[PDB]
Design a protein around this ligand. Structure first.
Ligand SMILES: O=C(NO)c1ccc(C(=O)N2CCn3c(-c4ccccc4)cnc3C2)s1
Ligand SMILES: [K+]
Ligand SMILES: [K+]
Ligand SMILES: [Zn+2]
Ligand SMILES: [Zn+2]
Length: 391
């Protein structure tokens, strides 16, 4: 059926395409979606390069021309330049040579394609051509600032897509949720003074001591945007690590009450999976299950009438990102999800997480009615919170 979940992917984002895939992140996720038959139930959407004008909704002209255009256009030596871009591999295939100067050039070109791929999917959902969508896209975008690439990001795909929704379709309210384990500093910057888009980040913060070092609970916006930047910053380190119970409690007490009050017209998700188990201690440190992300997706699908697009950001462990991508797409298709273990449903969130949640709720009680009514119940398990709503 055509009114269903869309997927966007493009082999031109790959360093090396290879049958029987070795094989990087997005090629592996695409295979898992193909192999499980989820792609078959989905509408596959054709991507394209973002235009230079589209990238300039977020980034400076200078940034866009430097990283967004083929350097050879400014310049026997052509045949020699083309030759060393490529290398023949032990599978008998060819790829972009990762040991050369073309590694970062190609990644920036991949980034330009990633933005257009996301824009295409977002517009089909926002317009009702599609219901839902997931963008299988690389590199990530959420750390790229107006004039600064960083943390493997060149262009902020999700922020560009939001700017174009506002400028082309006049979308009144957009919610961006960012659940990559790292703060989306780029996205925060792009909308910091704008009350028409609510940015909500869940991230490891530990009082400024985790990459990229931004995203304090204090940072609530500037000007008329005051109140519309929510940093659900976890602090306390890994004593113990954050897991399913902690993120589920954060959705119950902070994310869903604020997002529900805001009442967005479209939801965009910066969907990194580096919080799932399999991402050791400097990269991630947390141990969410892949299946928890299927549940978080289903929660957000209750907003904006279900007009939601998830865009892959970080995540490295192949099993983890494939398990998680599978759970999110399955949720978007409306399939029944694997139930969360009794263990997770019974578990009270750890003390560091409760403290973190209460700090944010305190700061944002000033700006949201849903946090003015009551006392905190952040320390309850899901079963307990369920039990103690009734009577
Ligand atoms: O998830 C991501 N992008 O999607 C990340 C971007 C940047 C990340 C990050 O934490 N970095 C800090 C660690 N690091 C390193 C390290 C270099 C030596 C030892 C440990 C880490 C190189 N580059 C980085 C970027 S994760
Ligand atoms: K985040
Ligand atoms: K904002
Ligand atoms: Zn190969
Ligand atoms: Zn990340």
């Amino acid at each position: 059926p055509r009114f269903t979940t869309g997927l966007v992917y493009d082999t031109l984002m790959l360093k090396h395409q290879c049958t029987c895939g070795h094989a990087g992140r997005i090629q592996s996720i695409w295979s898992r979606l193909q192999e499980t038959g989820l792609r078959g139930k989905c509408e596959c959407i054709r991507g394209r390069k973002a235009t230079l004008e589209e990238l300039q909704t977020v980034h400076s002209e200078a940034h866009t021309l430097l990283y967004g255009t083929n350097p050879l256009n400014r310049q026997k030596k052509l045949l020699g330049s083309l030759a060393s871009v490529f290398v023949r591999l032990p599978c008998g295939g060819v790829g972009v040579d990762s040991d050369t100067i073309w590694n970062e050039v190609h990644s920036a070109g991949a980034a330009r394609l990633a933005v257009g791929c996301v824009v295409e999917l977002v517009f089909k959902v926002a317009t009702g051509e599609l219901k839902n969508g997931f963008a299988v896209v690389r590199p990530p975008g959420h750390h790229a600032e107006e004039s600064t690439p960083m943390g493997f990001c060149y262009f902020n795909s999700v922020a560009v897509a939001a700017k174009l929704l506002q400028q082309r379709l006049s979308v009144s309210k957009i919610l961006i949720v960012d659940w990559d384990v790292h703060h989306g500093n780029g996205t925060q910057q792009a909308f910091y003074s704008d009350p028409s888009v609510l940015y909500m980040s869940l991230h490891r913060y530990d009082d400024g001591n985790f990459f990229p070092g931004s995203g304090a609970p204090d940072e609530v916006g500037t000007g008329p945007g005051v109140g519309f930047n929510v940093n659900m910053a976890f602090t306390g380190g890994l004593d113990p690590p954050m897991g399913d119970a902690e993120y589920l409690a954060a959705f119950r007490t902070v994310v869903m009450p604020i997002a529900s009050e805001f009442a967005p017209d479209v939801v965009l998700v910066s969907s990194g999976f580096d919080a799932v188990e399999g991402h050791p201690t400097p990269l991630g440190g947390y141990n969410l299950s892949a299946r928890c992300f299927g549940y978080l997706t289903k929660q957000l699908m209750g907003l904006a009438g279900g007009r939601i697009v998830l865009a892959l950001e970080g995540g490295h462990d192949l099993t983890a990102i494939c398990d998680a991508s599978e759970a999110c797409v399955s949720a978007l298709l409306g399939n029944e999800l694997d139930p969360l273990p009794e263990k997770v449903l019974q578990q009270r969130p750890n003390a560091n997480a409760v403290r973190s949640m209460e700090k944010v709720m305190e700061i944002h009680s000033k700006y949201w009615r849903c946090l003015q009514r009551t006392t905190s119940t952040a320390g309850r398990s899901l079963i307990e919170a369920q039990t103690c709503e009734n009577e």
